Amino acid sequence: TTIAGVVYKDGIVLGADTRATEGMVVADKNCSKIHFISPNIYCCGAGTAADTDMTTQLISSNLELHSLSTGRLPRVVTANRMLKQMLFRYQGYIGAALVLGGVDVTGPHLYSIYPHGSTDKLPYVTMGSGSLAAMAVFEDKFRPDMEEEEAKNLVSEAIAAGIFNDLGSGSNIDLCVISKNKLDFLRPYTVPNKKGTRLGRYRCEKGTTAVLTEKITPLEIE
């Protein structure tokens, strides 16, 4: 897993890979590691996938209630505090490394949340197995007050560096741009690698497989 985020001049850009590995076999491709917490707050997740999914969903629901009651868009600090307090209560047994990104009345905020309840507000963050390579790219090429296209290019480069160099990561790249004005969620922004053409067709003709028994049960379409 590589997830990464950066703050550009008028918002945030979040990026992640789309590979899920159970052991050392790629259990899934085109997995979505960018989650919805609120209209203005999206969060990437890494670590235990179920923990990331469920904690992000729970905080999404709590912030939905909070925003409904207060009548104003949710703040990023509220999401950060909810997440960190839950994670601290569970003492790291729920395993989630999260890049929390959203824009609110204060401005653009990017937070990085560790499994034990630590949080860090930063201009740029990375998490997962490829965090070191992504951080290498960020440390090299991040500059303050970047434009949106520049930030997208940087995050794509970092997630790509994580993809190629790290084994656990690798698939299409996803991007998400949150601005004060708009949100653009970009399932595959880039497709760095593709499966090669199958030279030989092995399509099994009918009758290739023997069958001891069969039972056809008609369904009453209606």
Q: Residues with catalytic annotation?
A: 1
Neighbouring CB atoms inside 10 A of 16's CB total: 30
d(CA 161, CA 91): 32
Q: Which long-range contacts (CB under 8 A, 24 or more apart) does 140-148 make?
A: 142/6, 145/8, 145/9, 146/6, 146/8, 146/9, 147/8, 147/9, 148/8, 148/9, 148/10, 148/11, 148/13, 148/177, 148/179
Which of 71/143 has CB closer to other proteins?
A: 71
Binding of other proteins by 199 (CB under 8 A):
no
Pair of tokens at residue 138: 């960020």
Which of 38/78 has CB closer to other proteins?
A: 78
Which of 109/152 has CB closer to other proteins?
A: 109
Interface with other proteins (CB under 8 A), residue from 145, 181, 196, 217: 217
Q: What are phi and psi of 179, to 5 degrees?
A: -125, 170
Interface with other proteins (CB under 8 A), residue from 10, 122, 179, 183: 122
Binding of other proteins by 58 (CB under 8 A):
no
Beta bridge partners of 186: 175
Binding of other proteins by 75 (CB under 8 A):
yes
The residues binding other proteins (CB under 8 A) are 20, 22, 25, 27-28, 30-31, 48-51, 53-54, 66, 69-72, 75, 77-78, 80-82, 84-85, 87-88, 91, 93-94, 105, 112, 114, 116-120, 122, 132, 198, 202-206, 208-219, 221
